[PDB]
Symmetry: C3
Subunit: 326 residues, 3 copies
Amino acid sequence: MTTADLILINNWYVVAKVEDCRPGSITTAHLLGVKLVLWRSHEQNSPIQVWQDYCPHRGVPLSMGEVANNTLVCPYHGWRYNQAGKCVQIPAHPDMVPPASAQAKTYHCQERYGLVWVCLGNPVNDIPSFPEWDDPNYHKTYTKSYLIQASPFRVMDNSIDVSHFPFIHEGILGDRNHAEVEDLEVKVDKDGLTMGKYQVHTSKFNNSTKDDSMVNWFRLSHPLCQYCSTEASEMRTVDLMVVTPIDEDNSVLRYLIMWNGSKTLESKILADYDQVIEEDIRILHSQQPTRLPLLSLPQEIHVPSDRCTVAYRRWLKELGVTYGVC
Amino acid sequence: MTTADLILINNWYVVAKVEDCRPGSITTAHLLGVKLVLWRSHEQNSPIQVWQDYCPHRGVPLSMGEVANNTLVCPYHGWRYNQAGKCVQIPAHPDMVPPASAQAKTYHCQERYGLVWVCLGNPVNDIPSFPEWDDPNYHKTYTKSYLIQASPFRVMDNSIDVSHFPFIHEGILGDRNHAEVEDLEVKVDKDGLTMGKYQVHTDSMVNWFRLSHPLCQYCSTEASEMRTVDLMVVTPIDEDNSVLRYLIMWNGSKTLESKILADYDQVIEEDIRILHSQQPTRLPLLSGLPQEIHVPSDRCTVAYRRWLKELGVTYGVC
Amino acid sequence: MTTADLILINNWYVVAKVEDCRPGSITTAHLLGVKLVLWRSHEQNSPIQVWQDYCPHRGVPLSMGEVANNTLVCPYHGWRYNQAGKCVQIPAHPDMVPPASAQAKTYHCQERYGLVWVCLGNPVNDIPSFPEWDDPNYHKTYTKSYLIQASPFRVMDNSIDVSHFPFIHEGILGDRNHAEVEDLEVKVDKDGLTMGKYQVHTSKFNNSTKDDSMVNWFRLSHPLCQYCSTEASEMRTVDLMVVTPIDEDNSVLRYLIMWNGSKTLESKILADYDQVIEEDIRILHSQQPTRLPLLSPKQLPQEIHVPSDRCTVAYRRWLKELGVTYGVC
Ligand SMILES: NC(=O)OC[C@@H]1N=C(N)N2CCC(O)(O)[C@@]23N=C(N)N[C@@H]13
Ligand SMILES: NC(=O)OC[C@@H]1N=C(N)N2CCC(O)(O)[C@@]23N=C(N)N[C@@H]13
Ligand SMILES: NC(=O)OC[C@@H]1N=C(N)N2CCC(O)(O)[C@@]23N=C(N)N[C@@H]13
Ligand code: FES
Ligand code: FES
Ligand code: FES
Ligand SMILES: [Cl-]
Ligand SMILES: [Cl-]
Ligand SMILES: [Cl-]
Ligand SMILES: [Cl-]
Ligand SMILES: [Cl-]
Ligand SMILES: [Cl-]
Ligand SMILES: [Cl-]
Ligand SMILES: [Cl-]
Ligand SMILES: [Fe+3]
Ligand SMILES: [Fe+3]
Ligand SMILES: [Fe+3]
């Protein structure tokens, strides 16, 4: 049984890309300790069902079955479950109405921004906003998924931290000889956590061109999804960073990236993200304790450039998070 | 050393094939949480000793030793144990009589049907009967062993289940156009659990089976021109792991042996795919989160769960 | 960060050889459940720092950093720690004085006999003596380190046991035609555990005794370091056996060996030790329970003891008397 807090259960999380879930497909995923099955009927534009991956007859994963005639069919005795999760046929007794108990545990699913979002509980909140999604001046791309052996809150803590840039992203986002961090603007309010415009010192790459001089800001409406905005020399790049909380100690990381420069930059964008992400994963894998320490092994130390990661920890306690934190 | 229920401790289980326990040999097995050593002296027709795999001096497995002169010799300090498990020689003190505590933990062992049977407790029952063993009209063959990451009681539950045949054994035991299951006849007695004759569809065979005890099943199938029986024996390694073996006998042509073994292998591997996936691992008795649902074609597997609860089984179940 | 008994925490243990800690190097070790980082400046004859492998800012291992300008630099935000473990530079705030909390957890470290000794607590004893260290008639050599999946107290128990020699070390320390064990002399007092001189059967002629044997004795001042002496044919070999208690169930084993015979014996000595150690590891890995059983007023079945077990019984009795509960059962 999931020990996640209600505040986490009642939120939306990404579990897959829509483009990887074809009609007729069966996909597995994991969310807040729960094993999920995602399936679609073979019809074009069919919805995605997201259920607990478990047949209540003899305990077989329904994901080992098959999709047929708009049902998911268990492999073991062939019980057929309709789109609402109700068993509508037991082959051993074809004239018998299946018992009302023969029902899959179903969850909420929405497709948004080409991503599959799931809510295991009763969705109080909305899916986070992504204003550029419907802007045709912006192209889109998606990173691969990254499976990370770290708490989802440590993953997000690292992506709120800006002072590490000249050290583990040396050569892309700065150098150890330019590591001073200016005062940061941070607010935690009704819109969530927002880091105000911050100047990022970048390493020179193309000697023919002007300095990149990027300015970054971001906002988290909810604690595992970050909207990030970067203004560079002649282009804006935005992204939605979504962390899937597999369990307390493990995460999946994905980005949806949009930019209003040339579509031909997609390869460079994906490779630059991959380089930065893997540098962060080396740190994340190593951090102890695995779960994120909240405010109160020696205690964490905080300096002024930690203002936003301190605010993140404060927010998590205000939210009542106990899962994935310590 | 085992924490299994007395009702399980006092029953017989197969742990090896006799052909693998040659004179002079040392082999191992694992039963109800206990590590076992099996050994024989080099004399022809010597008996098989089955002991806990543990030298009580400094805790080394006796299976790392050697068989010498009707004794098993521990590799660490060379203490020698005779066929009764009594230490008869301590090399550091060759004239000393070894203390009474210098004694291997021994278990009951009987060879039957070409199989090595072990009882860790006090045998209250005989080894299950297999009447065709003495019928020379029937040929015999043995499957290989199958190591399964599932509770032994889930392994047997899967074998008692007949309604899954059309879905995971299509072409050998079932037909997806004939998935309906007729009314089943099941009885639980002091003779054990018995399922009455049942039509299989694959032609049309008639099958029945009986379990005298919960982890050994006698199965009988009559086809057009042939009867096939088997003894299915499941070694309960622990609560969560099993060894599966079959002794198969049939009264048709001797030439059918390789096809019989191939068909069994196909069916067994199809079942193992399901067994490895089932959660929870241990077999739920009557009373993933939701509780089991039962329909009429589950009559025999429901009776099996009821029998285990009546017997007081708590090991390997939930 | 350790559940070890105070009697173990306040003792010295070897965690590395000095030759594996070159100037500028970062290495790791593990002691009583604590992850350690060992580092030195690039300077000639720089000291060895041994710290908990942990940056208290955001919990990254300092062993993932780099040595620069006689400081250890954390890879994540570049905090620089001096040889005393004090943070002297926070690059995000270059003119700010680091808070007093910005300090690595440091441990007592000493180099002796070419080995790196560490005490995680407050050392009550000196490092064991090794008198031949100063003697110019003795050559020295070092085995490699051996990682063993067994309790450090089982590792030492196996090294105090002599009656197994004819059975698992046949041809180096005994043979099965010479398996009888003489009455053993054992004492446990202020000096620790001592086994008195006893005869080990070999294959080479001893010119002092006029048969194929050697004379061995050993002493443990503390439960995980053994001084061992062996004499045959006018040549003497001594060693210091040091066990690193990684945690309750795992060990590192090292030997420092000195001998007064030919320098050409060195490779033979190393090969003999490697064979004997691997023979013992085969047994150690198989033993159950993993932790060393102590003696109990009571009655898996309890161990059995015979007279040739006198010194390993004394070892178990000593550990109970000392109050050891970690790595034993
Ligand atoms: N050019 C490039 O790789 O940018 C990465 C992109 N921009 C940041 N400032 N990052 C800091 C942390 C981070 O996760 O890498 C990210 N945060 C979000 N949302 N997207 C990333
Ligand atoms: N032709 C073939 O593979 O038959 C398998 C054989 N016969 C059955 N009806 N089975 C159903 C289940 C089962 O375990 O496979 C088995 N039960 C026993 N005792 N033997 C097997
Ligand atoms: N020639 C050779 O390999 O000798 C091993 C050497 N000498 C002993 N008598 N041993 C007995 C046990 C043991 O651990 O192998 C050891 N104990 C210590 N201190 N050093 C080893
Ligand atoms: S386990 Fe799913 S139909 Fe029986
Ligand atoms: S451990 Fe078996 S003889 Fe010593
Ligand atoms: S974690 Fe070491 S400097 Fe930040
Ligand atoms: Cl469909
Ligand atoms: Cl579609
Ligand atoms: Cl019906
Ligand atoms: Cl023999
Ligand atoms: Cl035959
Ligand atoms: Cl049985
Ligand atoms: Cl001590
Ligand atoms: Cl000494
Ligand atoms: Fe980063
Ligand atoms: Fe089957
Ligand atoms: Fe030894």
